[PDB]
Every structure is written in C-alpha cells, then in structure tokens.
Design a protein around this nucleic acid. Structure first.
Lengths: 110, 195, 49, 48
RNA sequence: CCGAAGCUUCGGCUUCGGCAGGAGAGGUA
DNA sequence: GCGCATGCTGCTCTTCTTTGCCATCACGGCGACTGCCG
DNA sequence: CGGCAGTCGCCGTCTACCTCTCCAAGAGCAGCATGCGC
C-alpha cells in the first residue's frame, strides 16, 4: 500500500487522473488503488487588477498514485488511457519501487 | 548533467571498456541507471575501523540472537502453559502432541527467519569488508543498507557523473607498466587480452 | 481493430445510461487506413496508358 | 533532435532546481542520455 | 546573381523586387 | 442593468513502448564473448 | 582455473539518365463575446 509513481505524456495529468479514478470504480478494484494526488503549486499572474492563480504542476508528467502491489492492479493502472508507464528502473526496470515514505510525506507538505 | 559519447562506448570493441577494464554489459548497466558502482574506497580508516566494526558487528549479532531468544522464550512459554493446563484430556495425549508439533513447526519457522536475517547481516559484513574500486553493486536495498551503517569510507553512485570520477582519478602509467609486466612474463589468453 | 481497441478502452470510462452506439464508434482510423493504402503504397500503382 | 535535446535539458534543469526526489531525477537523466545518443547516432542502441 | 526605375561626368551611383528538401513506383543503355 | 455561462477561436505544443504491438530480412567473412562443461 | 564451441553483432553487395505521386491531425489550454437569467 505504498506510494508509487507513474508517468503521463504532457498535460494529461488530470485526464489521467479522471480516467484512473472512474476506471477503478467501473473496472472494479476499490481495494488496491486508494489515493491519487497530483502535486501542484501556484503562479501569480496578476494582470494589474485581475488575479489568476493558474495551475503550476511542480512535477510535469509524474502522477504519484498509492497502489497495493499485485498484477491486475498493475494492469489496470498502467493501461489507463494516457499513462506512458511506471517508474523505478533501479532494478533494471522489472517492478516499480515504492517511493521512500519520508519523501512522500515531504512531497505532501502542501 | 554529463553524458557519454556513443562512439567511444558502443563500439567493437569498446574503447571505454578497454581503458577502464569493464565488461560492456557492466558499462551499459552503470550508464543507463540500473546498477551502482564504487568510485573509491578509503583503505586507511577502513583498515582500522575494520577491527573496530568487527567488535561492533559482534555486539550487533549478539543483540540480534538474544532478541530471537527472548521472542522464542515468551511465545514458547505461553504456548506450553496453555497446552499444559489441558493435555487433551477428552481423547488422548496424542492430540496435545499434535498441537505441540504445530507449535514446534512455528518455532522452527521463526528459527529459520532469524537465521536468515543473521546470514544476511553476514553478507553485509562480507561485502563491506572486501570492497575494491570498480565493483558493480546491484540491488538498491544492499546499497542503501551499506550507506546507512558504513556510509563513510566508501563512495560511489550511478550515471555518467560516476564514470567521470573514475576517469578523473585514473593513472595511465601504472596500468601501462602493469600491462607490460603481464606481457613480459605470461601465456594463455591473458597475453592476448594484454595485447 | 484500431477502432475496436479505442471503443474497448472508452467503454470503461463513460457513465452508463448515456452510452449509445454513436458515441462509442470512431471513424478516423478506418478512413486513415483506407486513404493510406490507396495513396502512398507500393501495390496501388499509377496506371500507364 | 535538437528540439528534443533542448526540451529534456530544460526539464532537467527545472526539476533539479526545485528539490525533486531522486527517482524522478534519475529517470529524467536517463531520458536525456538516450536523447543525446539518438542525436549522435540513431539506431545504434535500442529502437530508432 | 537577374529584373524594373532614376542620376549618370560614362568609371559607375541610388531605390525596389526575387528561390530550389525526402520517400516510393515504373523505364532506357 | 450586471454577472455568469457556453461556444468561436487564437495558439502553441504533442505524439510512450507493458502483462502490448509486431512482421519479417539474404549471404559470406570476421572477431569478440560468454555461458558451459571439464 | 581452464578450455571450448556456439553465437551474435557489424561490415559489404557497379555507373549514367528519364517520367509520375505524396509528405500529422485531432485534442487541449486559455481568451474572450454575447446571450440569458435575476
């Protein structure tokens, strides 16, 4: 149930989000994937009297998704329309590696 | 970040591999972020903290074994008390013997577990002791373990930035006279490799 | 086959009771394949007269 | 191929000067290396 | 480099205007 | 009369490689290499 | 350690000339403009 990472194209982080979210319910796996968060920051685009606060994704192309490691979970997650593939080539690239929990908590500071 | 010229690494033969004395598969693994390598290992401090950490690791292993003993103690005691308050008096002593067999199987499981942890610590010690430059260390777990316990002395990383360090700390002359000594008095196929 | 892969992947992301055959079908791959065969191909050749 | 190299270098610079975790930086560095390799010699390693 | 237009002392001077890579198929000696 | 919502429309990229897609490719010469048997 | 034989990748495969066709598009992210509601 650790926090893993995934890779999307570019600008498809929220499409990937919605897709995965709904799929988990339609495909029927509300017991492996639990939480999805896309890290995002802020950009002050004031037009001298008109604020904006537009999406400024700190890590463009990377969506961290908590997932219990299995096999069909890997299938549904990686085959969601939009994701390029998993991360974690530390061991050649066979299985993803769980992101250091402390690093996850520091990423979730905001 | 530094990169590597394709001409001097993916050739026939590999000129970088011939200069650094590394197999092409090892170079491919290091360059493309799939394994670690030890850039340098301090041999002075290590040669003293050798005995120092020998003592330390003996202590650690003792602690580990004693914790095993204690868990064994607790669990065994409780189980035996339970099975003693009732030696399956409704049928025969054999049902209690069978649950005692189950308990002993559990015992042996925990035994194997702790023993394997012991030999993995042994592996740790081995790897950390006899460690020389240019020694591919696969498995991220092992690397992080070593960098947690004995994070000093040895250094290393992966990527082309870790090959720049190996090339920078390289002495051509010593290797040249070493190869000439090998060619002078040698036979077999090591002479062909030296040539 | 390409259109079938698209519809299979999209059948699990839409909401039921609003799914109709016209919203599940994409024509673009088929017309693209046909126009790629009848144009830049090595077997559909310019006729000599 | 130049645009690919420049894009990967810019993404790597922005990610390094932000405090990113090590796994993501390693992935980006590997991808930059592959892009440069494809610039100098396309098809020698992997797929064209 | 070419064209158009002016000054031109006949050496020339000035204004404006203008571009050309790959893949596949068939054929002749 | 003013605020909010939804459609013309500038406007600048974007296009991977798994449990998938993909299907193969002669023929000879040469040299490393690499697991494998002793 | 020490031979050992299959194997796997990389190199090369004649000259000059003529004619024709075809060479990423949909999705997405804003940026408003006008219609509709209270």
């Amino acid at each position: 149930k650790n926090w893993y990472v995934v890779h999307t194209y570019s600008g498809y982080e929220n499409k990937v989000k919605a897709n995965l979210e709904k799929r988990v319910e339609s495909m029927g796996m509300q017991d492996k994937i639990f939480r999805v968060v896309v890290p995002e920051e802020e950009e002050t685009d004031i037009k001298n009297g008109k604020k904006k606060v537009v999406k400024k994704k700190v890590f463009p192309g990377y969506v961290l998704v908590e997932i219990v490691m299995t096999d069909d979970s890997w299938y549904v997650v990686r085959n969601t329309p939009g994701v390029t593939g998993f991360v974690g080539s530390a061991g050649s690239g066979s299985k993803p590696t769980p992101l250091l929990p402390g690093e996850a908590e520091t990423i979730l500071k905001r | 970040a530094p990169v590597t010229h394709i001409w001097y690494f993916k050739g026939v033969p590999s000129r970088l591999g011939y200069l650094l004395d590394l197999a092409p598969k090892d170079l491919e693994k290091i360059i493309y972020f799939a394994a670690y390598v030890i850039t340098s290992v301090d041999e002075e401090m290590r040669h003293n903290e050798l005995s120092t950490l020998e003592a330390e690791m003996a202590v650690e292993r003792k602690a580990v074994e004693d914790q095993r003993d204690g868990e064994l103690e607790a669990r065994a005691q409780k189980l035996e008390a339970d099975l003693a308050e009732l030696e399956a008096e409704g049928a025969k002593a054999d049902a209690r013997r069978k649950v005692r067999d189950g308990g002993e199987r559990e015992m042996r499981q925990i035994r194997d577990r702790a023993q394997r942890e012991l030999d993995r610590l042994e592996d740790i010690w081995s790897t950390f002791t006899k460690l020389a430059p240019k020694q591919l260390i696969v498995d991220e777990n092992l690397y992080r373990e070593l960098v947690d316990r004995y994070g000093e002395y040895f250094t290393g990383a992966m990527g082309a930035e870790s090959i720049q360090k190996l090339i920078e700390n390289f002495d051509i002359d010593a290797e040249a006279e070493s190869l000439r000594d090998v060619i002078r008095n040698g036979k077999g196929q090591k002479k062909l490799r030296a040539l | 086959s390409r259109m079938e892969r698209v519809v299979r992947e999209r059948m699990t992301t839409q909401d039921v009771e609003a799914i109709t055959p016209q919203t599940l079908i994409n024509i673009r791959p088929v017309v693209a394949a046909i126009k790629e065969f009848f144009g830049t191909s090595q077997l559909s050749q310019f006729m000599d007269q | 191929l130049y645009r690919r190299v420049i894009n990967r270098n810019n993404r790597l610079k922005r990610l390094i000067d932000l405090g990113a975790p090590e796994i993501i930086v390693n992935n980006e560095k590997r991808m930059l290396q592959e892009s440069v390799d494809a610039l100098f010699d396309n098809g020698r390693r992997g797929r064209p």
